[PDB]
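Q: For a teaching handout, I want to show students what a protein-ligand complex looks like in token form. Below are the inputs, and the small molecule is BIS(adenosine)-5'-pentaphosphate. Please produce the holo structure.
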Amino acid sequence: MRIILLGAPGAGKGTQAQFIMEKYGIPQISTGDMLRAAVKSGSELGKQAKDIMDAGKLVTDELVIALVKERIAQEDCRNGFLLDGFPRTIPQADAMKEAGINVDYVLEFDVPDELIVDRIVGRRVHAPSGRVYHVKFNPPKVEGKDDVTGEELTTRKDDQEETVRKRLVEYHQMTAPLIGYYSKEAEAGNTKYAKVDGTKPVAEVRADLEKILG
Ligand SMILES: Nc1ncnc2c1ncn2[C@@H]1O[C@H](COP(=O)(O)OP(=O)(O)OP(=O)(O)OP(=O)(O)OP(=O)(O)OC[C@H]2O[C@@H](n3cnc4c(N)ncnc43)[C@H](O)[C@@H]2O)[C@@H](O)[C@H]1O
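A: Here is the structure, written as tokens, with BIS(adenosine)-5'-pentaphosphate included.
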């Protein structure tokens, strides 16, 4: 099963990607996670994103498509994968087309723009795993620590109010067009498209998703 998650910054994509992964055994390929990791390792493919992500901007398509093709080539992806954060632009969606990567489901997480900045200021992450928490909406079982490893949670560098605003504008300009792109793909019979209400509580969003996927 191959799934794309689509949605504005902070719509809950990464939070739901951990449930789909654990419940359906398909790997989560998250380009934000792969790029923060590359920046942190000084990996030649991806360390270049450091300043772009800091500014709230999209990294070049050519770079991100290279990372994703590499990852899909690892033996875990031969039986499905979940794309979280990719495609992010119409060139990245076309590249998937050209390459024979068709998906089963595209899920749009809809959230109003006005909720995004407070979701993101309460966000705390366990960086090694990419697990994400919210101090109010979805807190860890022990404050400040990841549930699994007991390691201290941190804040992302690009999760301040002005970088989020910048990210919202780039989302509306470049990424929002993918809703029409893939809705056209669903019309043609090439994928299934399902929209979910990302304002519902985390567990409730989790339950709508089980109705769509099995
Ligand atoms: N393909 C690509 N092309 C080019 N550049 C690329 C690229 N991919 C990445 N990049 C780059 O990397 C940068 C950042 O990219 P990004 O891909 O956005 O990495 P991100 O910040 O980790 O995640 P998102 O902004 O997408 O939020 P999300 O929808 O996953 O929601 P989450 O579950 O955390 O939820 C948010 C918060 O709210 C919470 N929450 C979740 N669900 C709910 C709910 N139902 N109710 C209430 N609160 C909730 C969470 O606990 C959390 O605290 C970009 O600016 C760009 O530079």
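A: Two things your students might notice: The chain is about 45% helix and 15% strand. Residues 1-214 form a domain with the Rossmann fold fold (CATH 3.40.50.300).
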